Amino acid sequence: LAAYMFLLIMLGFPINFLTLYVTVQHKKLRTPLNYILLNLAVADLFMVFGGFTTTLYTSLHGYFVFGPTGCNLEGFFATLGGEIALWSLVVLAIERYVVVCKPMSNFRFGENHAIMGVAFTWVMALACAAPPLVGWSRYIPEGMQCSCGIDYYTPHEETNNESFVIYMFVVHFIIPLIVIFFCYGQLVFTVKEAAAQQQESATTQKAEKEVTRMVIIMVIAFLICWLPYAGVAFYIFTHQGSDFGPIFMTIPAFFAKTSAVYNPVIYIMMNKQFRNCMVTTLCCGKNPLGDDEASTTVSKTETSQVAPA
């Protein structure tokens, strides 16, 4: 964790470091184009601090150990950087989502969330089977009395290759191929229809040029980190010889905690990067500042046209 930060994420710090402040702020202005900062930004978000507070000082090392609760790298970030980021995700249903509308649906529910809603978020978070069964596999090996274990595996890391690894992917998170994201009806009218993002992101409905790019950035909103991670845990964060590996923090943890680079993360903001108001020092047109007085009169031109305000 030392080395990791000390060099490698002396790049999160200070680009992200300073510029977190410019951005995040109680998730600055929910709920137009700022999808990421509504969520994914909770897990990822938190990695940064995080940092000393829960993953350097006290959080896998030192003493130690700690955590408290189950690492507490493990049972926090290592699920929270799925489930709970993605369970917050309803505050993206109201975005990757009302890029257009598919208006109101019927007499109900045009209030898009609520039902779907759970038939959205209670899908994108549904690897919530780890919280349970993986999590039972930190209880024991109890991830505090043990320190992080050791031990009390053997039976049956072999025989329950079902619920552990590899299950958190299994084919479970084949969701964004098979029905998700399209299945919203309106998402059978975005990206896949060049009748969207293009015309309507050059200068319609939302925040501009970056909202063009989510013709393709789109799909990297929901198969980033969490989707492919089962194959990472599979080899390895289970057996070998407890103490040296697991805890194999070396390779398997390093990718998810590059999330501290809030730079290309944030880069594809949209409606509240340009037409931002507060913290008018982001990527845009005039660039890296303005012209962005503010208001909130739809999109942004390049620049402070169309329209103040």
From Swiss-Prot:
It is a multi-pass membrane protein. GO terms for biological process: absorption of visible light; cellular response to light stimulus; detection of temperature stimulus involved in thermoception; G protein-coupled opsin signaling pathway; G protein-coupled receptor signaling pathway; gene expression; microtubule cytoskeleton organization; photoreceptor cell maintenance. The chain crosses the membrane at residues 1-22, 35-57, 72-94, 114-134, 164-185, 214-235, 248-269. It is found in: Membrane; Cell projection, Cilium, Photoreceptor outer segment. Keywords: Acetylation, Cell projection, Chromophore, Disulfide bond, G-protein coupled receptor, Glycoprotein, Lipoprotein, Membrane, Metal-binding, Palmitate, Phosphoprotein, Photoreceptor protein, Receptor, Retinal protein, Sensory transduction, Transducer, Transmembrane, Transmembrane helix, Vision, Zinc. The record marks 74 as: Plays an important role in the conformation switch to the active conformation. Zn(2+) binds at residues 162, 240. Residues 58-71, 135-163, 236-247 are extracellular. Disulfide bonds join 71-148. A lipid is attached at residues 283-284 (S-palmitoyl cysteine). Photoreceptor required for image-forming vision at low light intensity. Required for photoreceptor cell viability after birth. Light-induced isomerization of 11-cis to all-trans retinal triggers a conformational change that activates signaling via G-proteins. Subsequent receptor phosphorylation mediates displacement of the bound G-protein alpha subunit by the arrestin SAG and terminates signaling. PANTHER family: OPSIN. Homodimer. May form a complex composed of RHO, GRK1 and RCVRN in a Ca(2+)-dependent manner; RCVRN prevents the interaction between GRK1 and RHO. Interacts with GRK1. Interacts (phosphorylated form) with SAG. Interacts with GNAT1. Interacts with GNAT3. SAG and G-proteins compete for a common binding site. Interacts with PRCD; the interaction promotes PRCD stability. Forms a complex with ASAP1 and ARF4. Forms a complex with ASAP1, RAB11A, Rabin8/RAB3IP, ARF4 and RAB11FIP3; the complex regulates Golgi-to-cilia rhodopsin/RHO transport in photoreceptors. This is Rhodopsin. The gene is RHO.
